[PDB]
Design a protein around this nucleic acid. Sequence first.
DNA 1: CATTAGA
DNA 2: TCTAATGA
Length: 327
Amino acid sequence: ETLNGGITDMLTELANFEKNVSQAIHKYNAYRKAASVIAKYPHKIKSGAEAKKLPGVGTKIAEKIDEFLATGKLRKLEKIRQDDTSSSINFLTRVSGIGPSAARKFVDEGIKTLEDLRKNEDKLNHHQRIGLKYFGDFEKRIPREEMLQMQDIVLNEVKKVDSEYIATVCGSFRRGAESSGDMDVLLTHPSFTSESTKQPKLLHQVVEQLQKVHFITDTLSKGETKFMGVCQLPSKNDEKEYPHRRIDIRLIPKDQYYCGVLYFTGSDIFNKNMRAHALEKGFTINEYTIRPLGVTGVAGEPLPVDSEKDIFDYIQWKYREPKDRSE
DNA sequence: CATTAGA
DNA sequence: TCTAATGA
Ligand SMILES: [Mn+2]
Ligand SMILES: [Mn+2]
Ligand code: NA
Ligand code: NA
């Protein structure tokens, strides 16, 4: 956690670099187990060898260790960090929509900068177009103060269209979070569950409405169950306009809301931990349901859930408010 | 790990 | 169809 810090650190630096600049999934994949392990190791690793003893730690990595323990540096790391080429790849990458593959490609073509990114807006797909567009506003945090406004709104329309829709703004915001990266609305409806062959319009109506009133200003990807866009709160009585925000809304078969909600609510560890728990308690929990476990090793049969509670009850736990789902 | 764009 | 990118 701190004792093995630098090690795993350059380690992740290293892996992340393969997979991005290089198409070296393996080596990249290497660096990670190693980093994974040394990370777990209970003692200050003092030299290649020591480390070396570990599963996943080869002569290659071990080699880097020493260099690193001897000199609090690494050439490859010093050389990469410099590399204008791989710098570019790391950078272009931030663009919402740009990934390594494309990061490379642009680079090759010679699109290194954001300005390059502009002059060549043609070479970019819509995703990335918007991605380039709201580049600033994308990178910014979302004041809870604003979250409340946004949430306030979504809620309204959702209801306006059909009183029957149920909505939940999940993620950190739900968990208290003084800020947030983007809003996650989870949605469901009674008419929609496990069997009943969809009703695509379900998602649809909603989006249409959101845009209807001008909340959603763009579409990143509307699909039959996952919309993915951009929103913005009405810029009041001018002088101060609102930053474009990522928004995601997903339709859910009513008979799986809570688990999903539970899930998306996090935190990542509370989740795990909870998950890890359901298990001893003789169960299974995942993004959509919760199943009683059986001795033969495994089992099925999706237990009924009416609220975050039910889930808790099941594994017989203490109801924990979103606020304290921190871990 | 699954859902959407795109080509 | 596959192959990218998001997310989480
Ligand atoms: Mn999100
Ligand atoms: Mn989020
Ligand atoms: Na070893
Ligand atoms: Na990106």
